[PDB]
Amino acid sequence: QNLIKNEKFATEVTNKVTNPSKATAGEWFIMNNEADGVTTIAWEQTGDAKYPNAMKIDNSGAEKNTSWYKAFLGQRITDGLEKGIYVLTFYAKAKEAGTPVSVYIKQTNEEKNDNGKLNTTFFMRRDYDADAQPNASGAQYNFKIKDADKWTKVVVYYDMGQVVNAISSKKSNPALEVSDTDDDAAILKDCYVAILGQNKGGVVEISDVTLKKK
Numbered sequence: 001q002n003l004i005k006n007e008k009f010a011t012e013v014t015n016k017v018t019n020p021s022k023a024t025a026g027e028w029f030i031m032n033n034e035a036d037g038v039t040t041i042a043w044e045q046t047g048d049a050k051y052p053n054a055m056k057i058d059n060s061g062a063e064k065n066t067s068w069y070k071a072f073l074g075q076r077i078t079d080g081l082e083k084g085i086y087v088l089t090f091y092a093k094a095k096e097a098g099t100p101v102s103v104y105i106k107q108t109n110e111e112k113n114d115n116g117k118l119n120t121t122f123f124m125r126r127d128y129d130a131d132a133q134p135n136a137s138g139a140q141y142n143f144k145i146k147d148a149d150k151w152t153k154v155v156v157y158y159d160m161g162q163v164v165n166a167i168s169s170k171k172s173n174p175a176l177e178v179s180d181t182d183d184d185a186a187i188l189k190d191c192y193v194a195i196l197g198q199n200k201g202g203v204v205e206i207s208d209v210t211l212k213k214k
């Protein structure tokens with residue numbers, strides 16, 4: 001089954017939270033902790049019969065790319081995931097050719113480490129290889145939308161059986177660790193999908209989202 005609810009945005013989404021820990025599971029939420037005026041994330045009816053409702057992430061107001069932890073479309077999942085492989089799929093439309101759209105799947109309620117900083121725990125994108133991809137995130141997947149004004153399939157596999165302890169690249173972060181997810185890991189019981197379009201000036205629309213065990 002699709003684990004994402006309101007997958008085609010047939011129900012209007014307006015709920016904003018200031019932290020995913022406050023989001024009601026099984027619903028979409030809007031995270032926009034960027035400064036007032038930087039981005040607008042909102043529900044829309046598109047006029048396109050194939051994707052008639054969508055979320056629009058509009059970075060027209062941005063002077064800089066937006067932050068991974070500040071501005072995104074999210075959905076918290078508390079149904080209890082299995083250690084296994086999952087596919088996340090959706091359709092996206094960009095105002096400008098080449099605009100990226102992005103994904104990560106993060107633990108909702110993190111503990112702090114010995115040094116007082118919140119952990120950042122993510123499921124590993126399945127194709128991550130730290131040796132071959134020293135400059136890439138192991139958590140966040142990015143896909144360039146090649147054409148403007150065209151609904152485009154976005155597909156990424158995640159391994160819920162592996163986690164990474166940072167969103168940063170291996171080269172940038174000697175503390176980065178990939179590990180096997182514990183059977184009792186908190187992330188399996190309470191996580192959220194984040195869909196983002198961070199580029200300054202870009203406008204990305206999102207519709208028809210699926211998360212499925214494969």
Ligand code: NA
Pocket residue numbers: 036037038039040041061
């Ligand atoms: Na705004």
